[PDB]
Design a protein around this ligand. Structure first.
Ligand SMILES: [Hg+2]
Ligand SMILES: [Hg+2]
Ligand SMILES: [Hg+2]
Ligand SMILES: [Hg+2]
Ligand SMILES: [Hg+2]
Lengths: 42, 671
């Protein structure tokens, strides 16, 4: 069981920024399957 | 359903608690998740919690074994602000024996609605009945917003990893569990989202963000997960949404974004339905399924390839390049009409004298020209007649054999006709003068005030450090003496904030153009000898042969060469030619688009940087071409040349005799 209360969730923002990622050319895996757009697909 | 009366009971008491509650000030009471995360108890990368791989089920789900839903999956990031929990389907009928409302996690009553629902207000109600919460600091529009995103997130966490997120996600107890969470993150430890900062005017700098697309079709709306604003895509984005790349519900990463219609502060909730943000294609590149809506760690802008830049919008925030080539300064001129003109130094100093000379003659010619405008039957029946009209009376005194001795022969009314045609002549002269001045003086002040519009430019041929390349051009206007000596060929820099990648010109559309604006900064980074040679091909002074073999495009066509001039030729009708011959008695010709640099007299050691190939090679009569960026010289000190010249300086300091003459014979015959 994954204790949600422990999950480093999506929208847990970092206010103080000053405490791979982006892909070069716009259209060429990870930038395909968005944990949020699918509920839009169906 | 209930006899529908035990609900207001539960409601008036609910309403009273809040009533008293807000009637005060009390001690905080972080919620469930806030006090959890708030500690040590090891967290769990939203990634790790899924072996790493985005979705794991498609179609009608591998099946709804674990747990899916209806009227939940058939939902969107634009309607979750409404969901409505059928109070009946989540507690069953075992907890429904309770008509005093369902008590919930964290403390705080969520009372179903008469209608059998559990929507926004219900939660707003509860979240106020919730201990450690002050209902003065929250409000219906506040919960609304959050009830939206705190849903879509959960929902989405459904049709995605069914195997690790059952429905243990969308229960009304993680909603009121989070809404409390947010009230802790934002109203208690008063920590502000990324867009709430920005909007409230407390970080504005639209520096590296991770946002998410929501509503879309003139403009779209992005979110940091907490609040959302309506962006403003540039043409190239306008296309990537109309084509379907920016799929509402995806994460991107802009850079120098910015605001329009943004006076000051305001709470993202009272967001002016005008204000908008401005994403810019070249400074935006999709971000992984997971990430982190909000500001991003590395505050330093991210680079990327020219190869990927577009042109209908955006400046690049950063580009990691290598100074392939470097050309000499150009003294551009904006013609009074349109069109711009390019001139070397020699030319914009020739033209600078040829003008300020000419148009300094005009300034005097206006006055030289206004300076050159200063210095029968008895005479008795006649004197009586040539007395009536004053016009002929004057005449009769000027073309007069005898002066004031005649006008003394008439002392009447007709002596007041001449003295009246006399003073009208003065106020005719005095008119021209006065006017003739002004007229001029005023046309010179309209002369002396006009000037040539001249500024200067520096072109650099740079290429992305990351293999291959698309060597585009960097133009730097009025280059500070510094900049000029910092950039050198074959080096690495990370130029940040470069002009709206304006499209190139001349024939087709490949590659692109870079211009640096007043907010560009050049950071020089190092390079390993060992890994330079891939992209960076130094300047090379051809051995003349190359121009022969159909395999040596030789860097964008530019070549630099050495040689001796056999003979100049200035073909009647403009377009000089310069015949050069190297050491292997090979010949080529340089077509001149500019003006011969003096020294190019027949038979002299001549070096030359920046020459362009012309069609139809392979014919003993090659054809280079000297343009604006061409340099020439009788004594080049440059490296790459040093050899190839000592080489050609050989057969000149060797035979020296039957040489030049034979070349002449070589070239003389080819004609
Ligand atoms: Hg969940
Ligand atoms: Hg604002
Ligand atoms: Hg080149
Ligand atoms: Hg030779
Ligand atoms: Hg060539």
């Amino acid at each position: 069981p994954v204790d949600l209360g422990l999950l480093e969730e999506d929208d847990e923002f970092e206010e103080f920024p000053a405490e791979h990622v982006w892909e070069d050319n716009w259209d060429d895996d990870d930038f395909s399957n968005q944990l949020r757009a699918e509920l839009e697909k169906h | 359903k209930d006899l529908m009366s035990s609900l207001q009971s539960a409601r008036d008491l609910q309403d009273m608690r809040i009533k008293n509650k807000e009637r005060r000030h009390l001690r905080l009471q972080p919620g469930s998740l806030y006090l959890t995360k708030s500690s040590t108890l090891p967290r769990i990368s939203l990634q790790a919690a899924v072996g790493d791989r985005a979705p794991s089920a498609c179609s009608p789900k591998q099946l709804y074994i674990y747990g899916v839903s209806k009227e939940c999956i058939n939902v969107n990031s634009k309607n979750a602000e409404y969901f409505q929990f059928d109070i009946q389907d989540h507690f069953g009928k075992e907890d429904l024996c309770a008509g005093k409302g369902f008590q919930l996690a964290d403390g705080g009553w969520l009372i179903p609605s008469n209608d059998g629902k559990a929507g926004k207000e219900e939660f707003y109600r509860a979240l106020c009945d919730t201990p450690g919460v002050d209902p003065k600091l929250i409000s219906s529009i506040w919960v609304a917003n959050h009830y939206r995103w705190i849903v879509w997130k959960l929902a989405a966490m459904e049709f995605a990893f069914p195997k690790e997120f059952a429905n243990r996600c969308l229960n009304p107890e993680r909603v009121l569990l989070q809404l409390k969470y947010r009230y802790d993150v934002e109203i208690d430890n008063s920590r502000r989202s990324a867009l709430k900062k920005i909007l409230e005017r407390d970080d504005t700098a639209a520096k590296t963000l991770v946002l998410c697309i929501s509503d879309i079709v003139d403009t779209i709306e992005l979110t940091d997960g907490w609040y959302a604003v309506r962006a403003q895509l540039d043409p190239p984005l306008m296309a990537l949404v109309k084509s379907g790349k920016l799929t509402v519900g995806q994460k991107i990463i802009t850079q120098g974004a910015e605001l329009v219609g943004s006076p000051d502060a305001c709470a993202p909730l009272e967001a002016p339905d005008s204000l908008r943000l401005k994403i810019s294609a070249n400074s935006t590149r999709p971000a992984r399924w997971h990430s982190r809506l909000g500001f991003f760690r590395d505050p330093r802008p991210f680079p990327l390839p020219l190869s990927s830049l577009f042109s209908d919008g955006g400046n690049v925030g950063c580009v990691d390049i290598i100074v392939q080539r470097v050309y000499p300064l150009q003294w551009v001129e904006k013609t009074v009409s349109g069109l711009y003109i390019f001139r070397s130094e020699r030319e914009e100093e020739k033209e600078a004298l040829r003008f300020a000379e000419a148009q300094q003659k005009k300034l005097e010619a206006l006055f030289t020209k206004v300076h050159t405008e200063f210095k029968s039957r008895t005479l008795t029946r006649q004197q009586v007649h040539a007395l009536q009209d004053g016009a002929e009376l004057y005449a009769a005194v000027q073309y007069a054999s005898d002066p004031d001795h005649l006008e003394a022969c008439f002392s009447e009314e007709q002596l007041r006709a001449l003295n009246n045609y006399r003073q009208m002549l003065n106020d005719k002269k005095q008119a021209r003068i006065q006017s003739e001045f002004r007229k001029a003086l005023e046309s010179a002040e309209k002369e002396e005030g006009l000037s040539r519009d001249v500024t200067t430019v520096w072109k650099l041929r740079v290429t992305s450090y990351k293999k291959k390349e698309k060597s585009a051009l960097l133009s730097i206007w009025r280059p500070s003496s510094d900049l000029s000596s910092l950039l050198t060929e074959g080096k690495r820099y990370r130029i940040y904030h470069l002009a709206v990648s304006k499209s190139k010109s001349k024939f087709e559309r490949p590659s692109i153009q870079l211009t640096a604006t007043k907010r560009t900064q050049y950071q020089q980074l190092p390079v390993s000898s060992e890994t330079l040679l891939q992209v960076y091909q130094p300047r090379e002074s051809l051995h003349f042969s190359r121009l022969s073999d159909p395999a040596f495009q030789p860097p964008c066509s530019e070549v630099d060469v050495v040689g001796v001039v056999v003979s100049v030729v200035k073909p009647i009708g403009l377009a000089p030619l310069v015949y050069l011959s190297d050491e292997c008695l090979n010949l080529l010709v340089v077509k001149f688009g500019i003006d011969l640099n003096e020294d190019i007299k027949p038979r002299v050691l001549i070096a030359a940087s920046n020459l362009q190939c012309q069609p139809e090679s392979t014919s003993g009569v090659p054809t280079l071409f000297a343009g604006h960026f061409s340099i020439f010289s009788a004594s080049p000190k440059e490296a790459y040349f040093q050899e190839k010249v000592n080489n050609l300086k050989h057969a000149i300091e060797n035979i020296d005799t039957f040489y030049k003459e034979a070349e002449k014979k070589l070239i003389h015959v080819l004609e």
